[PDB]
Scaffold this active site. Structure first.
Site, mmCIF file in Angstrom:
data_model
loop_
_atom_site.group_PDB
_atom_site.id
_atom_site.type_symbol
_atom_site.label_atom_id
_atom_site.label_comp_id
_atom_site.label_asym_id
_atom_site.label_seq_id
_atom_site.Cartn_x
_atom_site.Cartn_y
_atom_site.Cartn_z
ATOM 1 N N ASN A 377 -27.175 36.202 80.313
ATOM 2 C CA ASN A 377 -28.365 35.924 79.517
ATOM 3 C C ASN A 377 -29.605 36.084 80.377
ATOM 4 O O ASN A 377 -29.718 35.422 81.404
ATOM 5 C CB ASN A 377 -28.347 34.515 78.934
ATOM 6 C CG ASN A 377 -29.593 34.208 78.150
ATOM 7 O OD1 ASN A 377 -29.681 34.536 76.968
ATOM 8 N ND2 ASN A 377 -30.577 33.603 78.803
ATOM 9 N N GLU A 378 -30.529 36.948 79.945
ATOM 10 C CA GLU A 378 -31.839 37.121 80.574
ATOM 11 C C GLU A 378 -31.707 37.272 82.086
ATOM 12 O O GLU A 378 -32.462 36.696 82.867
ATOM 13 C CB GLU A 378 -32.777 35.975 80.197
ATOM 14 C CG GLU A 378 -33.262 36.080 78.753
ATOM 15 C CD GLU A 378 -34.135 34.919 78.289
ATOM 16 O OE1 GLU A 378 -34.425 34.006 79.089
ATOM 17 O OE2 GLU A 378 -34.535 34.920 77.109
ATOM 18 N N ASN A 430 -33.686 39.165 73.571
ATOM 19 C CA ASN A 430 -34.370 37.892 73.355
ATOM 20 C C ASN A 430 -35.867 38.180 73.265
ATOM 21 O O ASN A 430 -36.532 38.337 74.286
ATOM 22 C CB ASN A 430 -34.060 36.902 74.481
ATOM 23 C CG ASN A 430 -32.571 36.508 74.561
ATOM 24 O OD1 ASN A 430 -31.795 36.727 73.625
ATOM 25 N ND2 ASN A 430 -32.184 35.899 75.684
ATOM 26 N N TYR A 436 -44.806 34.040 72.407
ATOM 27 C CA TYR A 436 -45.306 34.310 73.758
ATOM 28 C C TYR A 436 -46.085 35.626 73.725
ATOM 29 O O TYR A 436 -45.637 36.674 74.199
ATOM 30 C CB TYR A 436 -44.158 34.371 74.764
ATOM 31 C CG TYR A 436 -43.361 33.084 74.979
ATOM 32 C CD1 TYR A 436 -43.996 31.852 75.104
ATOM 33 C CD2 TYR A 436 -41.963 33.112 75.083
ATOM 34 C CE1 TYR A 436 -43.264 30.679 75.311
ATOM 35 C CE2 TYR A 436 -41.226 31.945 75.286
ATOM 36 C CZ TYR A 436 -41.889 30.738 75.398
ATOM 37 O OH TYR A 436 -41.185 29.576 75.594
ATOM 38 N N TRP A 509 -33.491 31.032 67.753
ATOM 39 C CA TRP A 509 -33.592 30.111 68.875
ATOM 40 C C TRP A 509 -34.588 29.026 68.500
ATOM 41 O O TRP A 509 -35.768 29.311 68.277
ATOM 42 C CB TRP A 509 -34.018 30.821 70.155
ATOM 43 C CG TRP A 509 -33.934 29.922 71.347
ATOM 44 C CD1 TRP A 509 -34.951 29.204 71.902
ATOM 45 C CD2 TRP A 509 -32.762 29.625 72.123
ATOM 46 N NE1 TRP A 509 -34.490 28.496 72.979
ATOM 47 C CE2 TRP A 509 -33.150 28.734 73.137
ATOM 48 C CE3 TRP A 509 -31.425 30.027 72.055
ATOM 49 C CZ2 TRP A 509 -32.250 28.235 74.077
ATOM 50 C CZ3 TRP A 509 -30.535 29.540 72.994
ATOM 51 C CH2 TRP A 509 -30.951 28.660 73.993
ATOM 52 N N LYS A 530 -38.448 24.578 69.702
ATOM 53 C CA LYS A 530 -38.282 25.769 68.863
ATOM 54 C C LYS A 530 -37.216 25.591 67.780
ATOM 55 O O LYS A 530 -36.906 26.562 67.063
ATOM 56 C CB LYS A 530 -37.942 27.000 69.724
ATOM 57 C CG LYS A 530 -39.108 27.540 70.566
ATOM 58 C CD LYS A 530 -38.656 28.709 71.426
ATOM 59 C CE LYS A 530 -39.739 29.196 72.362
ATOM 60 N NZ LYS A 530 -39.821 28.375 73.596
#
Ligand SMILES: Cc1cc2nc3c(=O)[nH]c(=O)nc-3n(C[C@H](O)[C@H](O)[C@H](O)COP(=O)(O)O)c2cc1C
Ligand SMILES: [Ca+2]
Length: 637
Positions: A377-378, A430, A436, A509, A530
């Site tokens: 992930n990320e 994502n 953002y 998310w 969130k």
């Protein structure tokens, strides 16, 4: 064989710096599931204790169910642990999310026996997760059990498994259920009974061989296909090691019969029909309790994820509780399961990714609800050692479970031409265009561009979301933390993503607010807001009902803005959500019109004079709301 739950009354110390030689009469008492970060992991200030803590309990051999060997079983111990029995260092484990076991037999004795577990959740560079949003709550946060079993038993030592691998293969209206078992210290005279049973008990197949034939094939005629929420039929496989006539050991599991494919253009397929995966992520923590969840907590989350009509759940960023996977089978949800290979590649983290992936698959292989495995992930933003690691995992997941597909979640900023994107079978991204920075309209076109440049790589959205708290506005703009902008954000995202078949899965998310001790934002600290539902699960944000309007076959109507009561306008914009064709909005009994909506989002114009009790009817369904008129913008918003 019998199981002896070992949750009750452990002596806990945040203060000790070495395992006690003898049972402390001086410590604090906790019951499992327990965590020492339930308080300082959820109040913010980046302050929650990370270090080594100690648990100590005394059990008397005469108190355990009798068997020939004794195993301590940990369902969850975050993050690393050292087990001692009577001062003897028995084993060591790295990974807070998988099950693992320790054979106690040779260290157990008669009379009183002293068990000490030294749990540690401190920063290091070896054990994932280390850089992340969520709080790494330390402690024995899931059950601990003592297993008493025959000296000949179904495997207890291979990476937390059961030694029961059930692999259904659907062939037309029949299914061939291959069944492999793994045995420890089996002896020659023994035999193995195999049975599959109906959802209501009835026997369906059976075979018995000597202990040499560890692999058998049983067939179900006119198999009852596990087919998502529609009809989540579950069979049970069960295997009995038998020495002479007695049944000395036994192991069972539930399982489901289904096939599935992911078409790069037409999305996800379950049993040959388009079955679009539209769902949420979930964290395994909750307000108050931290990550020491009780069975009703697991069930509470499912009901809300189910009432909304999710069809898929990304279980980020780590292995969840079996009882949660078990529920996901029972309700037909389609699962993404992953390991905490997250945020930053650690060169000395490789050995640990491998073991958490091994544990993950071994312990969850029979869950019909899992269709993919998450590699990471990320994990980076750029365009090498990270690469070979990702190959090892991918090779692994395929070498061990060729019945499922590998995926991973990519950070928004990572160029789609980063070679590591070419490794898994599928891919999700994502993206937070509209939170953002960026604007909420970039999301649809972004997936459009990935689909054009890479038409053979199924692309998903594994994360998207926007923060919301108990703030409000009539000019909803990204960054005001208001429930209203989160409604619009998600309205916009639903229109762009649910209407694109090639997107194989979307994962909000996150379903729930969760604890991130380092964050300071929104007006409440150490929280990621969130979620579609609040931390304590008691409040469904308006965004939640936007998704219900698209996903749920249970009729309903929902007025938005119930919590925005005092308003400084003369006519106010009240959204309504429904999965009915026509909705009518009443202000103090007076109609405002019968509107119909294709996107299920009915917008309205209400004159705001004095008190205005609002009522919305849509077929059978009704929903009330209230409003008032003031000229002072109420500053608790
Ligand atoms: C779902 C699953 C469960 C397994 N459970 C066991 C087990 O309980 N005991 C065992 O000896 N092997 C088990 N295996 C097989 C091992 O993965 C296999 O023997 C492998 O080749 C061993 O390599 P390793 O020592 O590097 O793990 C299992 C395999 C799978 C896919
Ligand atoms: Ca804190």
């Amino acid at each position: 064989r019998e199981i002896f739950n070992l949750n009750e009354k452990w002596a806990f110390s945040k203060e000790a710096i070495k395992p006690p030689v003898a049972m402390p009469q001086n410590w604090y008492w906790v019951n499992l599931p327990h965590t020492w970060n339930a308080i300082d992991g959820q109040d913010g200030g980046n302050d929650y204790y990370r270090g080594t803590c100690f648990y100590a309990k005394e059990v008397q051999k005469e108190e355990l169910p009798e068997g020939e060997q004794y195993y301590l079983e940990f369902l969850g111990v975050n993050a690393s642990a050292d087990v001692y029995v009577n001062g003897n260092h028995l084993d060591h484990h790295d990974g807070g999310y998988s099950t693992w076991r320790v054979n106690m037999t040779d260290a157990l004795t008669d009379g009183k026996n002293l068990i000490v577990v030294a749990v540690d959740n401190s920063a290091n560079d070896r054990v994932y997760p280390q850089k992340a949003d969520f709080t790494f709550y330390g402690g024995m946060y899931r059950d601990v059990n003592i297993i008493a079993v025959n000296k000949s038993h179904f495997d207890l030592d291979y990476y937390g498994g059961n030694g029961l691998k059930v692999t259904p293969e659907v062939a037309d209206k029949n299914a061939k259920i291959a069944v492999e078992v793994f045995l420890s210290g089996e002896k020659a005279g023994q035999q193995l009974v195999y049975q599959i049973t109906d959802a209501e008990g009835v026997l369906a197949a059976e075979t018995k061989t000597g202990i040499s034939d560890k692999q058998v094939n049983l067939e179900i005629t006119d198999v009852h296909l596990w087919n998502g929420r529609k009809d989540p039929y579950l069979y049970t496989a069960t295997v009995r090691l038998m020495e002479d006539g007695v049944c000395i050991d036994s192991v069972s599991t539930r399982f489901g019969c289904r096939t599935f494919t992911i078409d790069p253009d037409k999305g996800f397929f379950l049993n040959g029909n388009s079955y679009p995966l539209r769902g949420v992520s979930r964290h395994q923590d909750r307000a108050g309790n931290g990550n020491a969840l009780l069975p009703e907590h697991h069930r509470e989350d499912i009901d809300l994820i189910c009432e909304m009509g999710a069809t898929t759940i990304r279980l980020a960023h780590y292995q969840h509780a079996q009882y949660f996977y078990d529920l996901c089978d029972e309700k037909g949800l389609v699962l993404w399961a992953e390991i905490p290979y997250i945020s930053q590649h650690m060169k000395n983290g490789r050995e640990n990714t491998i073991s958490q992936m091994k544990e993950l698959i071994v312990q969850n292989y029979n869950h019909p609800s899992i269709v993919v495995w998450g590699l990471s992930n990320e994990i980076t933003m750029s365009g090498e050692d990270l690469m070979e690691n990702h190959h090892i995992l991918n090779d692994l997941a395929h070498e061990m479970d060729p019945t499922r597909l590998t995926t991973m979640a990519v950070v928004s900023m990572c160029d789609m031409h980063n070679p590591y994107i070419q490794i898994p079978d599928v891919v999700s991204y994502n993206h937070y265009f509209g939170w953002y920075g960026g604007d909420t309209s970039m999301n649809g076109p972004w997936m459009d561009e990935f689909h054009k440049e890479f038409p053979k790589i199924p692309i998903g959205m594994s994360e998207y979301g926007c923060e919301a708290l108990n703030w409000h506005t009539s000019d909803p703009k990204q960054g005001d933390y208001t429930e209203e902008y989160q409604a619009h954000y998600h309205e916009e995202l639903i229109k762009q993503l649910y209407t694109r078949p090639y997107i194989w899965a979307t994962h909000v998310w996150n379903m729930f607010d969760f604890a991130a001790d380092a964050r300071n934002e929104g007006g409440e600290n150490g929280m990621n807001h969130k979620g579609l539902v609040t931390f304590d699960r008691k409040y469904k944000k308006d965004a939640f009902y936007a998704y219900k309007a698209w996903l749920s076959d249970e009729p309903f109507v929902h007025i938005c803005g119930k919590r925005y009561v005092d308003r400084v306008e003369n006519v106010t914009k009240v959204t309504v959500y429904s999965n009915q064709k026509t909705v009518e909005l009443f202000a103090n009994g007076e109609s405002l019109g019968k509107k119909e909506a294709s996107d299920h989002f009915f917008y309205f114009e209400v004159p705001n004079h004095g008190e205005t009790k609002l009522l919305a009817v849509a077929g059978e369904c009704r929903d009330e709301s209230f409003i008032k008129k003031v000229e002072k913008f109420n500053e608790a918003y």
